[PDB]
Design an enzyme around this catalytic site. Structure first.
Site, PDB file in Angstrom:
ATOM      1  N   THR A  99       0.842  -1.193   0.000  1.00 19.02           N
ATOM      2  CA  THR A  99       0.000   0.000   0.000  1.00 19.02           C
ATOM      3  C   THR A  99       0.875   1.241   0.000  1.00 19.02           C
ATOM      4  O   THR A  99       2.068   1.167   0.308  1.00 19.02           O
ATOM      5  CB  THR A  99      -0.975   0.040   1.242  1.00 19.02           C
ATOM      6  OG1 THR A  99      -0.292   0.436   2.424  1.00 19.02           O
ATOM      7  CG2 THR A  99      -1.693  -1.245   1.499  1.00 19.02           C
ATOM      8  N   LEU A 101       2.362   4.571   1.544  1.00 20.15           N
ATOM      9  CA  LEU A 101       2.858   4.865   2.880  1.00 20.15           C
ATOM     10  C   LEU A 101       2.474   6.324   3.210  1.00 20.15           C
ATOM     11  O   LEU A 101       2.821   7.251   2.476  1.00 20.15           O
ATOM     12  CB  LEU A 101       4.372   4.654   2.960  1.00 20.15           C
ATOM     13  CG  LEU A 101       5.048   5.075   4.270  1.00 20.15           C
ATOM     14  CD1 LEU A 101       4.762   4.066   5.400  1.00 20.15           C
ATOM     15  CD2 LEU A 101       6.526   5.277   4.076  1.00 20.15           C
ATOM     16  N   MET A 102       1.689   6.492   4.282  1.00 16.11           N
ATOM     17  CA  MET A 102       1.168   7.763   4.774  1.00 16.11           C
ATOM     18  C   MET A 102       2.180   8.297   5.783  1.00 16.11           C
ATOM     19  O   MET A 102       2.342   7.726   6.860  1.00 16.11           O
ATOM     20  CB  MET A 102      -0.233   7.545   5.383  1.00 16.11           C
ATOM     21  CG  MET A 102      -1.245   6.971   4.390  1.00 16.11           C
ATOM     22  SD  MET A 102      -1.453   7.972   2.887  1.00 16.11           S
ATOM     23  CE  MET A 102      -2.325   9.433   3.547  1.00 16.11           C
ATOM     24  N   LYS A 149     -12.040   3.885  12.498  1.00 12.53           N
ATOM     25  CA  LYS A 149     -11.624   4.624  13.688  1.00 12.53           C
ATOM     26  C   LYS A 149     -10.541   5.583  13.259  1.00 12.53           C
ATOM     27  O   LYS A 149      -9.955   5.413  12.186  1.00 12.53           O
ATOM     28  CB  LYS A 149     -11.093   3.666  14.788  1.00 12.53           C
ATOM     29  CG  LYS A 149      -9.870   2.834  14.409  1.00 12.53           C
ATOM     30  CD  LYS A 149     -10.008   1.516  15.067  1.00 12.53           C
ATOM     31  CE  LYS A 149      -8.758   0.696  15.052  1.00 12.53           C
ATOM     32  NZ  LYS A 149      -9.046  -0.629  15.653  1.00 12.53           N
ATOM     33  N   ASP A 166      -6.361   0.580   6.191  1.00 14.13           N
ATOM     34  CA  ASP A 166      -6.464  -0.585   7.069  1.00 14.13           C
ATOM     35  C   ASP A 166      -7.878  -1.176   7.151  1.00 14.13           C
ATOM     36  O   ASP A 166      -8.422  -1.359   8.244  1.00 14.13           O
ATOM     37  CB  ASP A 166      -5.894  -0.276   8.469  1.00 14.13           C
ATOM     38  CG  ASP A 166      -4.482   0.296   8.515  1.00 14.13           C
ATOM     39  OD1 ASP A 166      -3.794   0.278   7.470  1.00 14.13           O
ATOM     40  OD2 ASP A 166      -4.066   0.760   9.600  1.00 14.13           O
TER      41      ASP A 166
END
Length: 368
Positions: A99, A101-102, A149, A166
């Protein structure tokens, strides 16, 4: 100067496109996230290793295909899933998810220290989570996040956009055990532990995210443990912080989302049509100070959310703090005082007066 030269690649995707570095970014049961690299773009990615050991051959093939479904998810408010494949970890089968990457972290990390920035980022981040959820719910077949969340919402920056990441994998959360380890009680709808729930669990979790962004505090912090939260949630007892929501519109949306009965919950289609998400005026008025009904005078703040929508040479993030006597004052006369002081050109009077009227007429009604 970069010391990326010392990071040794320890694994490669079957495609050959991605490299794994033995640098762990995060943990969790069923998951380890690693720093990785895309050799097509030369941008650091997340190399996620997902594994449930106690999984049958049938369950494993359903988990592998659930992971492959995520590849085709392209939306500006969903963390991009570049590739997924099956591998082997400690002899047993595992899934690798590559994925985006933040780098600016999660909303949870942000809200531990900072309030969401003014004038528009609260409204925007909300609308962005709704748009992201709506995209997931409109897939064929629909995708339910299951684990929404603040820790699963990533930010590009404090004035940037939000991305949901996620996703809770259906196959990875089939059991009450898996749900108790993955899930965060605060963000979980009462029906999360039933064998059957729909996309309205994501609406309930959205309501809790928005509550946290509005109150700048953790939902159900009054509780000592998860059992106390579960008891309160299933009883229909709202978090004490819900009564700390000062904006009537924000309190209204939240309550419509965190309704005990799943069928009574608000739908995203209608939420996206809520006046709270409009930006046509370019002007908004909020309370600056906590309202004590012993007082006749309010302390208010006018935000110029869009300087382009106004005549004159206006700066970005312009905020006017002014008082308003609920008895003796009017929004139209106060807008004239703003014009006179040089805050606005006369032609913007109606727009100014409306932004004041919008905030001030409900509070005046509440007064006895």
């Amino acid at each position: 100067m970069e010391e990326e030269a010392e990071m040794k690649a320890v694994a490669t995707s079957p495609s050959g496109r991605f490299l794994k570095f033995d640098i762990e970014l995060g943990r969790g049961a069923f998951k380890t996230v690693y720093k990785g690299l895309d050799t097509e773009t030369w941008v650091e990615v997340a190399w996620c290793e997902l594994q449930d050991r106690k999984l049958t051959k049938a369950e494993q093939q359903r988990f592998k295909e659930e992971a492959e479904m995520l590849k085709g998810l392209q939306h500006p408010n969903i963390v991009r899933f570049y590739d997924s494949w099956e591998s082997i970890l400690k002899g047993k089968k595992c899934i690798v998810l590559v994925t985006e990457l933040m780098t600016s972290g999660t909303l949870k990390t942000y809200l531990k220290r900072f309030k969401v920035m003014k004038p528009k980022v609260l409204r925007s981040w909300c609308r962005q989570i709704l748009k992201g959820l709506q995209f997931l719910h409109t897939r064929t077949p629909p995708i339910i996040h299951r684990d929404l969340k603040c820790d699963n919402i990533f930010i590009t920056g404090p004035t940037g956009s939000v991305k949901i990441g996620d996703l809770g994998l259906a196959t990875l959360m089939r059991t009450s055990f898996a749900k108790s380890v993955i899930g965060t009680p605060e963000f979980m709808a009462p029906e999360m532990y039933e064998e059957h729930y729909d996309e309205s669990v994501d609406v309930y979790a959205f309501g809790m995210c928005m509550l946290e962004m509005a109150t700048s505090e953790y939902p159900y912090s009054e509780c000592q443990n998860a059992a106390q939260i579960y008891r309160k949630v299933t009883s229909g007892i709202k978090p004490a912080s819900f009564n700390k929501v000062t904006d009537p519109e924000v309190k209204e949306i939240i309550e419509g989302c965190i309704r005990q009965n799943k069928s009574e919950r608000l739908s995203i289609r209608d939420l996206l049509n809520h006046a709270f998400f409009a930006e046509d005026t370019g002007l908004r008025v909020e309370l600056a100070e906590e309202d004590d009904c012993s007082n006749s005078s309010l302390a208010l703040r006018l935000w110029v959310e869009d300087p382009k929508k106004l005549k004159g040479k206006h700066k970005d993030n312009e905020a006017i703090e002014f008082s308003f006597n609920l008895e003796t004052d009017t929004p139209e006369e106060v807008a004239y005082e703003m014009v006179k002081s040089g805050f606005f050109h006369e032609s913007d009077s109606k727009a100014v007066a409306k932004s004041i009227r919008d905030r001030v007429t409900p509070i005046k009604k509440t007064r006895e």
